[PDB]
Design a binder for this molecule. Structure first.
Ligand SMILES: OC[C@H]1O[C@H](OC[C@H]2O[C@H](O[C@]3(CO)O[C@H](CO)[C@@H](O)[C@@H]3O)[C@H](O)[C@@H](O)[C@@H]2O)[C@H](O)[C@@H](O)[C@H]1O
Ligand SMILES: OC[C@H]1O[C@H](OC[C@H]2O[C@H](O[C@]3(CO)O[C@H](CO)[C@@H](O)[C@@H]3O)[C@H](O)[C@@H](O)[C@@H]2O)[C@H](O)[C@@H](O)[C@H]1O
Ligand SMILES: OC[C@H]1O[C@H](OC[C@H]2O[C@H](O[C@]3(CO)O[C@H](CO)[C@@H](O)[C@@H]3O)[C@H](O)[C@@H](O)[C@@H]2O)[C@H](O)[C@@H](O)[C@H]1O
Ligand SMILES: OC[C@H]1O[C@H](OC[C@H]2O[C@H](O[C@]3(CO)O[C@H](CO)[C@@H](O)[C@@H]3O)[C@H](O)[C@@H](O)[C@@H]2O)[C@H](O)[C@@H](O)[C@H]1O
Ligand code: CA
Ligand code: CA
Ligand code: CA
Ligand code: CA
Lengths: 157, 157, 157, 157
């Protein structure tokens, strides 16, 4: 297998991703990703896209390479460019969730992050300070963002 | 491109199919297909498999070929072998529905079928008389059957 | 990602397979598989299909299931049904090769096989004695056979 | 069907493409694309990648959208950004060939191009003057470029 994706999207480990270049706040970035859907052929919407979730060191490496190869002239000595992913930090730092409802089973935070709770949002920080690992930021920041299409698999049980 | 399907399944036009050799009546054959599903990577079940629906002359020819190449020693000069698909003929012959909820936009019936309603069921009749086109049959008949995995596609607004 | 295969073929671990029902001798079965191929889009033939090779316990298990689920009424308490794969046993039992030129890195022989050398041929023996593991047979025997399409991968170096 | 491509590549019409951001002359860009190839699982080399060829108005539209959505801050009111594709204009303007040896069955030239031959090279000119349609240029100019993996398909005759 290679992952199969639609035009302009790119696949890694069974999921399809796309970096978007318009700058949106967190809630508007998530809603932008929700415009992509998965429908049954008889016409029922089953699922939406979401800001990307990340579940392994390899996935983190892939998304970092996606950002850095896509934005090479924007890479700074700082955190920038920061690109939203689907991470929400709630009332305490243990309250981490992904917008797609998947488990937080991978920790990609830059040392000292998250540090802007309660209710902050995660971003891949692809600048040289952070090398793609995540920063938390306030949700009103307007950033580029990565969407994932609905992640689904057949159950052959 | 080509259609991606799990091992033992086979693809045509974005859908995955498998011919099962146990003989079941219509409702039980549909129940057997429903054992296959589609789930989000989150773990939420999203959709269920079904007896195959058929929407074009190309799809009809593909399934006819699947049946005849899988059951070459059973091909008779009549209707047999008959293999269930997801077609339900109700109270009158115009009351045709697929178990997957898809439209009845393709007519694959042998001339003179359906003729065994009410509440008869569709089968690919792969014998030389019918050449794969459909017979309706009594629903208590136990036949081999074709399942499809949940048919889904991305909606890219 | 699943494996992508043409209609009527089925995929496992990046390779596409198909069980054929016509009974052929070994050389004719291999020739039948060589009728399928891989070409460039501008029309240069690059590779040919072959009788299946098998490189792991999981691939062995898959092909056994392919046979047993396709030929359920033919399963005996002995060796039958026997289905050709691309294995050639030469002048001694250690001279094992696959028709596709791939390495013999997996040993799927039934205990006591090969024992019909020299120049015998391997077959999945799906009857209950052998449980899909391989028997060697004489090449003049006419059996069902499994083909693989050309196995290819991108080289991203 | 969707197109299956390696990570960081993206598919259209059964072909896999990637925009590279380093600026190379035509020969060096073509050589960079030739680093990517196709091999048999056995390890035999089968094919070599190339700068992209273009065979329809839809393919032209897709590649233009890939460039424009990838380089939005670079789009000028002129021809820039120009991005190499595999088009060679030879001794006369009618002598057009693709580096991958495919047919020149589609004409994407901006009105008045080609005009800098002999032995000029084609580029998608994604600036607003030209809207993605092609300019010919001196082959020593250093531009971004689009690669395409070897285009192959199964032959099931
Ligand atoms: O969202 C990215 C980032 O925003 C805030 O930090 C900005 C700040 O970071 C760096 O300053 C230092 C250098 O060691 O890093 C930490 C930041 O936490 C500071 O204590 C320290 O001075 C850069 O050098 C500065 O240019 C930049 O202004 C926020 O504090 C971070 O948590 C993170 O969210
Ligand atoms: O489910 C199979 C088939 O069963 C019944 O027809 C069986 C009948 O079919 C053929 O007879 C003719 C053609 O000579 O076909 C129509 C079928 O209705 C008959 O009126 C006509 O005599 C075979 O030639 C016969 O041997 C066989 O007994 C049922 O009536 C069909 O609708 C269909 O469901
Ligand atoms: O290709 C299948 C198989 O063919 C030969 O064995 C077939 C043979 O097996 C059984 O005979 C016995 C029963 O005890 O099993 C061994 C198998 O080696 C024989 O020595 C013994 O007589 C069946 O009872 C027979 O009807 C059948 O003819 C071949 O010998 C095997 O290596 C294997 O290739
Ligand atoms: O490779 C890009 C482009 O380079 C040269 O044209 C650049 C030139 O284009 C436009 O000039 C006009 C406007 O009508 O277009 C033709 C292009 O040949 C010129 O004769 C004419 O002045 C822009 O307005 C200019 O700013 C820009 O300098 C080359 O001539 C083109 O063939 C094409 O290769
Ligand atoms: Ca922070
Ligand atoms: Ca009938
Ligand atoms: Ca033997
Ligand atoms: Ca020019």
């Amino acid at each position: 297998c290679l992952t199969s994706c639609p035009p302009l999207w790119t696949g890694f480990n069974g999921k399809c991703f796309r970096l978007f270049h318009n700058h949106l706040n967190f809630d508007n970035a998530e809603n932008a990703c929700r415009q992509f859907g998965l429908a049954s052929c008889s016409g029922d919407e089953l699922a939406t896209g979401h800001l990307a979730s990340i579940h392994s060191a390899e996935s983190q490496a892939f998304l970092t390479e996606l950002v850095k190869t896509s934005l090479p002239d924007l890479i700074t000595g700082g955190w920038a460019p920061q690109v939203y992913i689907g991470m929400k930090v709630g009332s305490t730092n243990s309250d981490q969730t992904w917008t797609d409802g998947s488990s937080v089973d991978y920790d990609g935070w830059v040392s000292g992050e998250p540090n802007n709770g309660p209710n902050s949002r995660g971003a891949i920080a692809a600048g040289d300070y952070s090398r793609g690992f995540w920063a938390d930021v306030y949700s009103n920041n307007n950033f580029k963002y990565i969407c994932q299409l609905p992640c689904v698999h057949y159950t052959l049980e």
